[PDB]
mmCIF file of N, CA and C in Angstrom:
data_model
loop_
_atom_site.group_PDB
_atom_site.id
_atom_site.type_symbol
_atom_site.label_atom_id
_atom_site.label_comp_id
_atom_site.label_asym_id
_atom_site.label_seq_id
_atom_site.Cartn_x
_atom_site.Cartn_y
_atom_site.Cartn_z
ATOM 1 N N UNK A 1 58.315 95.730 70.428
ATOM 2 C CA UNK A 1 59.138 96.846 69.970
ATOM 3 C C UNK A 1 58.244 97.993 69.535
ATOM 4 N N UNK A 2 58.498 99.187 70.067
ATOM 5 C CA UNK A 2 57.555 100.282 69.920
ATOM 6 C C UNK A 2 57.215 100.564 68.478
ATOM 7 N N UNK A 3 58.258 100.797 67.681
ATOM 8 C CA UNK A 3 58.087 101.022 66.251
ATOM 9 C C UNK A 3 59.133 100.230 65.484
ATOM 10 N N UNK A 4 58.717 99.614 64.386
ATOM 11 C CA UNK A 4 59.665 98.975 63.472
ATOM 12 C C UNK A 4 59.530 99.650 62.125
ATOM 13 N N UNK A 5 60.682 99.917 61.522
ATOM 14 C CA UNK A 5 60.763 100.623 60.260
ATOM 15 C C UNK A 5 61.284 99.650 59.216
ATOM 16 N N UNK A 6 60.454 99.281 58.252
ATOM 17 C CA UNK A 6 60.892 98.338 57.201
ATOM 18 C C UNK A 6 60.940 99.093 55.887
ATOM 19 N N UNK A 7 62.083 99.048 55.238
ATOM 20 C CA UNK A 7 62.281 99.814 54.024
ATOM 21 C C UNK A 7 61.569 99.237 52.801
ATOM 22 N N UNK A 8 60.781 100.075 52.150
ATOM 23 C CA UNK A 8 60.241 99.847 50.828
ATOM 24 C C UNK A 8 61.162 100.326 49.715
ATOM 25 N N UNK A 9 61.768 101.493 49.909
ATOM 26 C CA UNK A 9 62.678 102.070 48.914
ATOM 27 C C UNK A 9 63.760 102.837 49.663
ATOM 28 N N UNK A 10 65.024 102.691 49.280
ATOM 29 C CA UNK A 10 66.115 103.324 50.021
ATOM 30 C C UNK A 10 66.099 104.851 49.866
ATOM 31 N N UNK A 11 66.557 105.578 50.886
ATOM 32 C CA UNK A 11 66.724 107.025 50.808
ATOM 33 C C UNK A 11 68.178 107.335 50.479
ATOM 34 N N UNK A 12 68.605 108.564 50.718
ATOM 35 C CA UNK A 12 69.961 108.919 50.335
ATOM 36 C C UNK A 12 70.958 108.488 51.399
ATOM 37 N N UNK A 13 70.471 107.923 52.495
ATOM 38 C CA UNK A 13 71.314 107.469 53.623
ATOM 39 C C UNK A 13 72.289 108.511 54.129
ATOM 40 N N UNK A 14 71.843 109.746 54.052
ATOM 41 C CA UNK A 14 72.648 110.894 54.404
ATOM 42 C C UNK A 14 71.877 111.857 55.258
ATOM 43 N N UNK A 15 70.703 112.232 54.749
ATOM 44 C CA UNK A 15 69.914 113.297 55.330
ATOM 45 C C UNK A 15 68.769 112.722 56.165
ATOM 46 N N UNK A 16 68.909 112.832 57.486
ATOM 47 C CA UNK A 16 67.942 112.254 58.425
ATOM 48 C C UNK A 16 67.367 113.411 59.212
ATOM 49 N N UNK A 17 66.057 113.375 59.468
ATOM 50 C CA UNK A 17 65.508 114.488 60.251
ATOM 51 C C UNK A 17 65.896 114.335 61.709
ATOM 52 N N UNK A 18 66.452 115.379 62.313
ATOM 53 C CA UNK A 18 66.886 115.244 63.686
ATOM 54 C C UNK A 18 65.841 115.895 64.591
ATOM 55 N N UNK A 19 66.016 115.700 65.883
ATOM 56 C CA UNK A 19 65.165 116.340 66.855
ATOM 57 C C UNK A 19 65.115 117.847 66.591
ATOM 58 N N UNK A 20 63.903 118.384 66.595
ATOM 59 C CA UNK A 20 63.660 119.799 66.382
ATOM 60 C C UNK A 20 63.696 120.239 64.930
ATOM 61 N N UNK A 21 63.884 119.306 63.998
ATOM 62 C CA UNK A 21 63.835 119.610 62.564
ATOM 63 C C UNK A 21 62.497 119.219 61.993
ATOM 64 N N UNK A 22 62.062 119.914 60.957
ATOM 65 C CA UNK A 22 60.800 119.599 60.280
ATOM 66 C C UNK A 22 61.036 118.496 59.266
ATOM 67 N N UNK A 23 60.155 117.511 59.302
ATOM 68 C CA UNK A 23 60.097 116.466 58.302
ATOM 69 C C UNK A 23 58.832 116.694 57.467
ATOM 70 N N UNK A 24 58.979 116.556 56.147
ATOM 71 C CA UNK A 24 57.871 116.634 55.208
ATOM 72 C C UNK A 24 57.700 115.276 54.583
ATOM 73 N N UNK A 25 56.501 114.715 54.724
ATOM 74 C CA UNK A 25 56.236 113.333 54.341
ATOM 75 C C UNK A 25 54.932 113.184 53.553
ATOM 76 N N UNK A 26 54.848 112.110 52.798
ATOM 77 C CA UNK A 26 53.537 111.539 52.430
ATOM 78 C C UNK A 26 53.329 110.288 53.237
ATOM 79 N N UNK A 27 52.083 110.012 53.551
ATOM 80 C CA UNK A 27 51.800 108.801 54.330
ATOM 81 C C UNK A 27 50.429 108.241 54.035
ATOM 82 N N UNK A 28 50.264 106.945 54.302
ATOM 83 C CA UNK A 28 48.927 106.301 54.347
ATOM 84 C C UNK A 28 48.906 105.376 55.569
ATOM 85 N N UNK A 29 47.949 105.579 56.475
ATOM 86 C CA UNK A 29 47.876 104.760 57.682
ATOM 87 C C UNK A 29 46.768 103.732 57.544
ATOM 88 N N UNK A 30 47.022 102.536 58.028
ATOM 89 C CA UNK A 30 46.006 101.492 58.005
ATOM 90 C C UNK A 30 45.985 100.790 59.346
ATOM 91 N N UNK A 31 44.808 100.274 59.676
ATOM 92 C CA UNK A 31 44.622 99.404 60.829
ATOM 93 C C UNK A 31 45.004 97.998 60.445
ATOM 94 N N UNK A 32 44.992 97.108 61.440
ATOM 95 C CA UNK A 32 45.427 95.732 61.231
ATOM 96 C C UNK A 32 44.512 94.981 60.245
ATOM 97 N N UNK A 33 43.254 95.408 60.141
ATOM 98 C CA UNK A 33 42.308 94.788 59.196
ATOM 99 C C UNK A 33 42.334 95.453 57.820
ATOM 100 N N UNK A 34 43.262 96.388 57.627
ATOM 101 C CA UNK A 34 43.492 96.979 56.326
ATOM 102 C C UNK A 34 42.782 98.294 56.093
ATOM 103 N N UNK A 35 41.940 98.671 57.044
ATOM 104 C CA UNK A 35 41.140 99.871 56.928
ATOM 105 C C UNK A 35 42.052 101.080 56.911
ATOM 106 N N UNK A 36 41.860 101.952 55.937
ATOM 107 C CA UNK A 36 42.657 103.174 55.882
ATOM 108 C C UNK A 36 42.001 104.247 56.745
ATOM 109 N N UNK A 37 42.702 104.705 57.785
ATOM 110 C CA UNK A 37 42.142 105.779 58.630
ATOM 111 C C UNK A 37 42.599 107.190 58.293
ATOM 112 N N UNK A 38 43.716 107.311 57.565
ATOM 113 C CA UNK A 38 44.226 108.615 57.196
ATOM 114 C C UNK A 38 45.201 108.447 56.059
ATOM 115 N N UNK A 39 45.240 109.384 55.129
ATOM 116 C CA UNK A 39 46.282 109.366 54.103
ATOM 117 C C UNK A 39 46.517 110.766 53.603
ATOM 118 N N UNK A 40 47.761 111.216 53.577
ATOM 119 C CA UNK A 40 48.044 112.475 52.883
ATOM 120 C C UNK A 40 48.072 112.277 51.373
ATOM 121 N N UNK A 41 48.308 111.050 50.913
ATOM 122 C CA UNK A 41 48.294 110.789 49.475
ATOM 123 C C UNK A 41 46.900 110.979 48.900
ATOM 124 N N UNK A 42 45.889 110.488 49.600
ATOM 125 C CA UNK A 42 44.501 110.679 49.151
ATOM 126 C C UNK A 42 44.159 112.178 49.079
ATOM 127 N N UNK A 43 44.529 112.931 50.122
ATOM 128 C CA UNK A 43 44.297 114.389 50.159
ATOM 129 C C UNK A 43 45.125 115.072 49.079
ATOM 130 N N UNK A 44 46.248 114.464 48.711
ATOM 131 C CA UNK A 44 47.121 114.949 47.656
ATOM 132 C C UNK A 44 48.148 115.993 48.057
ATOM 133 N N UNK A 45 48.374 116.171 49.363
ATOM 134 C CA UNK A 45 49.260 117.224 49.818
ATOM 135 C C UNK A 45 50.151 116.633 50.921
ATOM 136 N N UNK A 46 51.459 116.927 50.894
ATOM 137 C CA UNK A 46 52.352 116.413 51.945
ATOM 138 C C UNK A 46 52.045 117.026 53.318
ATOM 139 N N UNK A 47 52.504 116.328 54.344
ATOM 140 C CA UNK A 47 52.281 116.680 55.730
ATOM 141 C C UNK A 47 53.613 117.015 56.370
ATOM 142 N N UNK A 48 53.659 118.077 57.153
ATOM 143 C CA UNK A 48 54.850 118.540 57.837
ATOM 144 C C UNK A 48 54.697 118.439 59.339
ATOM 145 N N UNK A 49 55.777 118.071 60.035
ATOM 146 C CA UNK A 49 55.748 118.085 61.502
ATOM 147 C C UNK A 49 57.154 118.272 62.020
ATOM 148 N N UNK A 50 57.274 118.684 63.277
ATOM 149 C CA UNK A 50 58.596 118.906 63.861
ATOM 150 C C UNK A 50 58.986 117.652 64.672
ATOM 151 N N UNK A 51 60.076 116.995 64.270
ATOM 152 C CA UNK A 51 60.483 115.740 64.903
ATOM 153 C C UNK A 51 60.766 115.937 66.403
ATOM 154 N N UNK A 52 60.208 115.045 67.215
ATOM 155 C CA UNK A 52 60.520 115.013 68.632
ATOM 156 C C UNK A 52 59.629 115.932 69.440
ATOM 157 N N UNK A 53 58.678 116.603 68.814
ATOM 158 C CA UNK A 53 57.845 117.557 69.547
ATOM 159 C C UNK A 53 56.517 116.993 70.059
ATOM 160 N N UNK A 54 56.243 115.720 69.810
ATOM 161 C CA UNK A 54 54.973 115.140 70.227
ATOM 162 C C UNK A 54 53.752 115.657 69.481
ATOM 163 N N UNK A 55 53.977 116.198 68.284
ATOM 164 C CA UNK A 55 52.907 116.607 67.385
ATOM 165 C C UNK A 55 52.248 115.428 66.700
ATOM 166 N N UNK A 56 52.905 114.277 66.793
ATOM 167 C CA UNK A 56 52.472 113.058 66.137
ATOM 168 C C UNK A 56 52.639 111.945 67.167
ATOM 169 N N UNK A 57 52.194 110.740 66.853
ATOM 170 C CA UNK A 57 52.387 109.627 67.780
ATOM 171 C C UNK A 57 53.869 109.308 67.944
ATOM 172 N N UNK A 58 54.178 108.655 69.059
ATOM 173 C CA UNK A 58 55.565 108.352 69.377
ATOM 174 C C UNK A 58 56.254 107.508 68.300
ATOM 175 N N UNK A 59 55.520 106.589 67.681
ATOM 176 C CA UNK A 59 56.110 105.765 66.639
ATOM 177 C C UNK A 59 56.570 106.615 65.458
ATOM 178 N N UNK A 60 55.909 107.740 65.209
ATOM 179 C CA UNK A 60 56.382 108.636 64.151
ATOM 180 C C UNK A 60 57.602 109.448 64.573
ATOM 181 N N UNK A 61 57.569 110.019 65.774
ATOM 182 C CA UNK A 61 58.728 110.785 66.240
ATOM 183 C C UNK A 61 59.978 109.933 66.212
ATOM 184 N N UNK A 62 59.878 108.678 66.629
ATOM 185 C CA UNK A 62 61.047 107.799 66.618
ATOM 186 C C UNK A 62 61.321 107.151 65.268
ATOM 187 N N UNK A 63 60.264 106.827 64.522
ATOM 188 C CA UNK A 63 60.397 106.091 63.281
ATOM 189 C C UNK A 63 60.854 106.974 62.146
ATOM 190 N N UNK A 64 60.249 108.155 62.008
ATOM 191 C CA UNK A 64 60.634 109.030 60.891
ATOM 192 C C UNK A 64 62.094 109.486 61.056
ATOM 193 N N UNK A 65 62.541 109.650 62.293
ATOM 194 C CA UNK A 65 63.944 109.940 62.585
ATOM 195 C C UNK A 65 64.920 108.892 62.013
ATOM 196 N N UNK A 66 64.449 107.667 61.782
ATOM 197 C CA UNK A 66 65.287 106.597 61.240
ATOM 198 C C UNK A 66 65.350 106.635 59.731
ATOM 199 N N UNK A 67 64.571 107.521 59.097
ATOM 200 C CA UNK A 67 64.468 107.545 57.644
ATOM 201 C C UNK A 67 65.365 108.616 57.066
ATOM 202 N N UNK A 68 65.887 108.357 55.865
ATOM 203 C CA UNK A 68 66.636 109.398 55.154
ATOM 204 C C UNK A 68 65.815 109.886 53.961
ATOM 205 N N UNK A 69 66.156 111.076 53.485
ATOM 206 C CA UNK A 69 65.349 111.701 52.443
ATOM 207 C C UNK A 69 65.278 110.830 51.207
ATOM 208 N N UNK A 70 64.063 110.669 50.689
ATOM 209 C CA UNK A 70 63.790 109.800 49.579
ATOM 210 C C UNK A 70 63.368 108.400 49.986
ATOM 211 N N UNK A 71 63.574 108.052 51.255
ATOM 212 C CA UNK A 71 63.232 106.713 51.704
ATOM 213 C C UNK A 71 61.711 106.546 51.780
ATOM 214 N N UNK A 72 61.248 105.365 51.410
ATOM 215 C CA UNK A 72 59.871 104.955 51.645
ATOM 216 C C UNK A 72 59.956 103.753 52.586
ATOM 217 N N UNK A 73 59.144 103.747 53.646
ATOM 218 C CA UNK A 73 59.188 102.695 54.657
ATOM 219 C C UNK A 73 57.836 102.458 55.219
ATOM 220 N N UNK A 74 57.676 101.258 55.750
ATOM 221 C CA UNK A 74 56.513 100.957 56.511
ATOM 222 C C UNK A 74 56.902 101.138 57.984
ATOM 223 N N UNK A 75 56.152 101.982 58.709
ATOM 224 C CA UNK A 75 56.297 102.203 60.149
ATOM 225 C C UNK A 75 55.203 101.429 60.854
ATOM 226 N N UNK A 76 55.594 100.391 61.578
ATOM 227 C CA UNK A 76 54.630 99.571 62.288
ATOM 228 C C UNK A 76 54.696 99.987 63.777
ATOM 229 N N UNK A 77 53.614 100.604 64.232
ATOM 230 C CA UNK A 77 53.565 101.265 65.530
ATOM 231 C C UNK A 77 52.675 100.476 66.448
ATOM 232 N N UNK A 78 53.297 99.911 67.463
ATOM 233 C CA UNK A 78 52.539 99.170 68.464
ATOM 234 C C UNK A 78 51.616 100.132 69.235
ATOM 235 N N UNK A 79 50.618 99.577 69.942
ATOM 236 C CA UNK A 79 49.694 100.530 70.577
ATOM 237 C C UNK A 79 50.378 101.470 71.571
ATOM 238 N N UNK A 80 51.396 101.001 72.280
ATOM 239 C CA UNK A 80 52.085 101.880 73.227
ATOM 240 C C UNK A 80 52.733 103.075 72.517
ATOM 241 N N UNK A 81 53.068 102.896 71.243
ATOM 242 C CA UNK A 81 53.678 103.948 70.417
ATOM 243 C C UNK A 81 52.650 104.658 69.542
ATOM 244 N N UNK A 82 51.371 104.360 69.736
ATOM 245 C CA UNK A 82 50.382 105.116 68.953
ATOM 246 C C UNK A 82 49.251 105.747 69.798
ATOM 247 N N UNK A 83 48.073 105.105 69.848
ATOM 248 C CA UNK A 83 46.942 105.556 70.680
ATOM 249 C C UNK A 83 46.625 104.736 71.916
ATOM 250 N N UNK A 84 47.369 103.658 72.141
ATOM 251 C CA UNK A 84 47.179 102.907 73.384
ATOM 252 C C UNK A 84 45.795 102.264 73.502
ATOM 253 N N UNK A 85 45.394 101.883 74.725
ATOM 254 C CA UNK A 85 44.075 101.278 74.946
ATOM 255 C C UNK A 85 42.943 102.286 74.703
ATOM 256 N N UNK A 86 43.246 103.576 74.731
ATOM 257 C CA UNK A 86 42.233 104.617 74.536
ATOM 258 C C UNK A 86 41.732 104.767 73.087
ATOM 259 N N UNK A 87 42.644 104.620 72.144
ATOM 260 C CA UNK A 87 42.242 104.782 70.752
ATOM 261 C C UNK A 87 41.946 106.248 70.487
ATOM 262 N N UNK A 88 41.247 106.518 69.394
ATOM 263 C CA UNK A 88 40.821 107.859 69.021
ATOM 264 C C UNK A 88 39.389 107.843 68.472
ATOM 265 N N UNK A 89 38.360 108.050 69.316
ATOM 266 C CA UNK A 89 36.992 107.768 68.845
ATOM 267 C C UNK A 89 36.654 108.357 67.481
ATOM 268 N N UNK A 90 36.087 107.517 66.617
ATOM 269 C CA UNK A 90 35.652 107.911 65.277
ATOM 270 C C UNK A 90 36.751 107.850 64.228
ATOM 271 N N UNK A 91 37.952 107.518 64.690
ATOM 272 C CA UNK A 91 39.124 107.358 63.835
ATOM 273 C C UNK A 91 39.868 106.053 64.131
ATOM 274 N N UNK A 92 40.338 105.900 65.376
ATOM 275 C CA UNK A 92 41.151 104.728 65.735
ATOM 276 C C UNK A 92 40.532 103.962 66.920
ATOM 277 N N UNK A 93 40.463 102.616 66.834
ATOM 278 C CA UNK A 93 39.946 101.754 67.931
ATOM 279 C C UNK A 93 40.963 101.522 69.033
ATOM 280 N N UNK A 94 40.509 101.048 70.188
ATOM 281 C CA UNK A 94 41.449 100.760 71.288
ATOM 282 C C UNK A 94 42.533 99.700 70.968
ATOM 283 N N UNK A 95 43.736 99.836 71.545
ATOM 284 C CA UNK A 95 44.793 98.810 71.415
ATOM 285 C C UNK A 95 45.161 98.466 69.968
ATOM 286 N N UNK A 96 45.167 99.481 69.098
ATOM 287 C CA UNK A 96 45.399 99.256 67.658
ATOM 288 C C UNK A 96 46.872 99.411 67.267
ATOM 289 N N UNK A 97 47.407 98.375 66.637
ATOM 290 C CA UNK A 97 48.703 98.518 65.950
ATOM 291 C C UNK A 97 48.436 99.263 64.649
ATOM 292 N N UNK A 98 49.173 100.340 64.418
ATOM 293 C CA UNK A 98 48.980 101.157 63.205
ATOM 294 C C UNK A 98 50.146 100.966 62.262
ATOM 295 N N UNK A 99 49.857 100.796 60.979
ATOM 296 C CA UNK A 99 50.896 100.727 59.945
ATOM 297 C C UNK A 99 50.836 101.934 59.053
ATOM 298 N N UNK A 100 51.979 102.583 58.886
ATOM 299 C CA UNK A 100 52.021 103.720 57.989
ATOM 300 C C UNK A 100 53.022 103.482 56.894
ATOM 301 N N UNK A 101 52.604 103.674 55.653
ATOM 302 C CA UNK A 101 53.517 103.697 54.497
ATOM 303 C C UNK A 101 53.890 105.136 54.369
ATOM 304 N N UNK A 102 55.150 105.439 54.680
ATOM 305 C CA UNK A 102 55.629 106.827 54.735
ATOM 306 C C UNK A 102 56.737 107.040 53.730
ATOM 307 N N UNK A 103 56.707 108.164 53.026
ATOM 308 C CA UNK A 103 57.854 108.574 52.216
ATOM 309 C C UNK A 103 58.370 109.889 52.759
ATOM 310 N N UNK A 104 59.663 109.958 53.063
ATOM 311 C CA UNK A 104 60.271 111.202 53.566
ATOM 312 C C UNK A 104 60.718 112.018 52.375
ATOM 313 N N UNK A 105 60.072 113.157 52.215
ATOM 314 C CA UNK A 105 60.306 114.016 51.068
ATOM 315 C C UNK A 105 61.427 114.990 51.281
ATOM 316 N N UNK A 106 61.455 115.597 52.480
ATOM 317 C CA UNK A 106 62.377 116.709 52.717
ATOM 318 C C UNK A 106 62.564 116.879 54.216
ATOM 319 N N UNK A 107 63.693 117.450 54.605
ATOM 320 C CA UNK A 107 63.915 117.917 55.949
ATOM 321 C C UNK A 107 64.143 119.430 55.862
ATOM 322 N N UNK A 108 63.577 120.163 56.811
ATOM 323 C CA UNK A 108 63.692 121.626 56.837
ATOM 324 C C UNK A 108 64.093 122.108 58.228
#
């Protein structure tokens, strides 16, 4: 399954980011061995992207769309939904399942 979204904390179950809408999130991404490759929480500033535009990996475009505002979830992105066999040199290895702890802050 490309992406699975497991809830850590419920959102308002009302406000979901739709295609072409901006989602504002905090996130922390980890590899299967626990290594943190990216976090907006560490940087201390939320991250914005436009849902469905391919600005992020496919697991995010599809997974964040399943979240409602205030929700915290783990997005488990299979390699086909992230970087595939190619990976991202110096950041992500080949064939990596990526886990993101994401909180959806706002839709714009």
